């Protein structure tokens, strides 16, 4: 699971870029897309840091059901970095995947 | 190129596991499989460390052409770790690649 953490910040940015989500909603999506080890508790410090670096930002909005939650959205800086991640990832993915099938 | 370094040790183990190679031969293969930034100079400290951790081992063998070179081969410990890398990689690769194609 040591490597899952390398790409976790990028996948969090991707998810948030596509939909405003609150903490529990985020980790649930992460779980169901294959990050089985993540929990709100384990990624919390990463969320605090991504905020301090202004990649994402939480705002208190009312939910479709009424109760007010802290939804996170991506900043312009965060989007720039998301694009960097997508580019790097497709590069490394292609490079490593082609290699490991040589025989 | 910050992420290319995460998986570089594993790809080096893969390559060495498949063929005994000397330093220049190794970096050439790395270049031609898409690690365009690597050079003998840049990966040297990583090779020294992989040796100190007993993942790979160099031995002075004679080349098909005669001159003696320092060829590297993988240790049992190195092979174990290579299998760990292959498992982790296929997991993360699948997880990230499926995610980044949601829309």
Numbering used by the authors:
A (entry chain A), B (entry chain A): 3 to 105
Paper text:
In this study, we have determined the crystal structures of bcPadR1 and bcPadR2, which are the products of gene loci BC4206 and BCE3449 of B. cereus strains ATCC 14579 and ATCC 10987, respectively. The bcPadR1 and bcPadR2 subunits contain a typical wHTH DNA-binding domain, consisting of helices α1, α2, the DNA recognition helix α3 and strands β1 and β2 (together forming the wing), and a dimerization domain, including the C-terminal helix α4. Unlike LmrR, but like the other PadR-s2 proteins with known structure, the bcPadR1 and bcPadR2 dimers have a completely closed dimer interface. The closed dimer conformation and inaccessibility of the conserved tryptophan residues of the bcPadR proteins are incompatible with a drug-binding mechanism as observed in LmrR.
Here we report the crystal structure of the BC4206 gene product from B. cereus strain ATCC 14579, a subfamily-2 PadR-like protein which we named bcPadR1. The gene encoding bcPadR1 (locus BC4206 in B. cereus ATCC 14579) is located immediately downstream from BC4207, encoding a putative membrane protein of unknown function. Overexpression results in an increased sensitivity against AS-48 (MIC value of 1.0 µg/ml compared to a MIC value of 2.5 µg/ml for the wild-type strain, p-value<0.005, >6 cultures as determined with Student's t-test) suggesting that bcPadR1 acts as a repressor of the BC4206-BC4207 transcriptional unit, when AS-48 is not present in the medium. Electrophoretic mobility shift assays further reveal that purified bcPadR1 specifically binds to the intergenic region between BC4205 and the BC4206-BC4207 operon. In vitro DNA binding of bcPadR1 was not affected by the addition of AS-48 suggesting an indirect sensing of AS-48 in the medium, although we cannot exclude the possibility that slightly altered in vitro conditions (e.g. different binding buffer) are needed to observe any effect of AS-48 addition on DNA binding. BcPadR1 was crystallized in space group P41212, with one protein molecule per asymmetric unit and a solvent content of 71%. As these interactions are crucial for the strong DNA binding affinity of RTP, it is likely that the conserved residues in bcPadR1 and bcPadR2 have a similar DNA binding role. This is corroborated by the observation of a bound sulfate anion in the bcPadR1 structure, which forms interactions with the highly conserved residues Gly25, Tyr26, Glu42 Arg71, and Lys72, likely mimicking the interactions with a phosphate moiety of the DNA backbone. The bcPadR1 dimer can be superimposed to the DNA-bound complexes of RTP and BlaI with RMSD values of 3.5 Å (for 176 common Cα atoms divided equally between both subunits) and 4.1 Å (for 153 common Cα atoms), respectively.
